[PDB]
Design a protein around this ligand. Structure first.
Ligand SMILES: CCNc1cc2oc3c/c(=[NH+]/CC)c(C)cc-3c(-c3ccccc3C(=O)OCC)c2cc1C
Lengths: 186, 186
């Protein structure tokens, strides 16, 4: 494909090198397509990167819905989502390029637009879990939105900053966190 | 002193121009030293930088040692420590060079190992809070090493992926997290 085969070459690049580290010159060569091409449906570079973040967020959200069936109660869904977070191939892998990207493009009032666009799509799973858990009487959370943002970010932090200790240790610290957290909601 | 001069000159060089832009040639001349001296003390730019990172972490501790006195209980120190980590990054100078360096040498066996020892120093601040909170029946934690690692990364998450929200909202969410988390230990 075209725009679709570029979005891949980019993803690979942003993940492998970082937001700046990778350039359009690079993208184009390996993607194999005149630069101008990129300019059509991919206005700027933020547009391309912001693009990938959306697809990646969506791919992940989709994977989770197709896997959350294995968790009967919302309590389990909390535990599970946080566990899978550590192993997916989606979105989380380029959380580091997001750190760059923000610091490097953080002074454009276009900053909080698509950038908050994601916030909402990223804390969604938690909103459902807690909301539904509230209905489902698994706990009573007066401020679902606050708790979802906290959980989302706390978890993202655990997945992103412990990227060296052996995988199974991670799975366990994560489960201890999920435990302490939910325990604090009651 | 000349070693100290170099570190000082280099730190400010990193702040203004960032990690990748700062050159050792500039570091050598502005500190009135020499390539050879720089080599003898640090071997490489990467290494000189990690060195600064270590000096900075000690200042942080010294700072924390003087600040925690304002918090009588450990429950209090936890809240206070999480809030300081959030507010200071708003204006920590090197923060950028760090984000820049952090990703550059994030897949490097050598550097990544040294960096992990650096975070360990951060993580200890929590260890102390939890061990002491134990000896005071503020809570009972039988896996302090684990809970410390969780606090650190959870907090880091909240501090890192939340720059779009306004500072009052971020601080409110952080104190809420501290509350939720702390509650899950009783
Ligand atoms: C009141 C003066 N304020 C300070 C504020 C700080 O805010 C920081 C925010 C961050 N924001 C999230 C992306 C990250 C990553 C590191 C920080 C460090 C840090 C940087 C390099 C090497 C060691 C440390 C360090 O302190 O390491 C162990 C504690 C830091 C240090 C001091 C003194």
């Amino acid at each position: 494909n075209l725009k679709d085969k570029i979005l891949g070459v980019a993803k690979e690049l942003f993940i492998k090198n970082g937001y700046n580290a990778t350039t359009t010159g690079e993208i184009v060569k390996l993607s194999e397509s005149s630069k101008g091409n990129l300019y059509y449906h991919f206005k700027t570079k933020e547009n391309l990167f912001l693009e990938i973040l959306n697809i990646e967020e969506s791919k992940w959200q989709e994977q989770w819905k197709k896997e959350q069936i294995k968790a009967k109660t919302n309590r389990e869904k909390f535990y599970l989502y946080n566990e899978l977070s550590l192993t997916t191939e989606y979105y989380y892998p380029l959380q580091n390029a997001i750190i760059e990207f923000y610091t490097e493009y953080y002074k454009t009032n276009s900053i909080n637009e698509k950038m908050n666009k994601l916030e909402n799509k990223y804390i969604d799973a938690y909103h459902v879990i807690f909301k539904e858990g509230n209905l489902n009487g698994e706990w009573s959370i007066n401020d679902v939105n606050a708790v979802s943002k906290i959980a989302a970010n706390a978890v993202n932090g655990i997945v992103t900053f412990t990227h060296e200790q052996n995988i199974n240790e991670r799975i366990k610290l994560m489960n201890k966190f999920s435990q302490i957290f939910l325990n604090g909601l009651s």
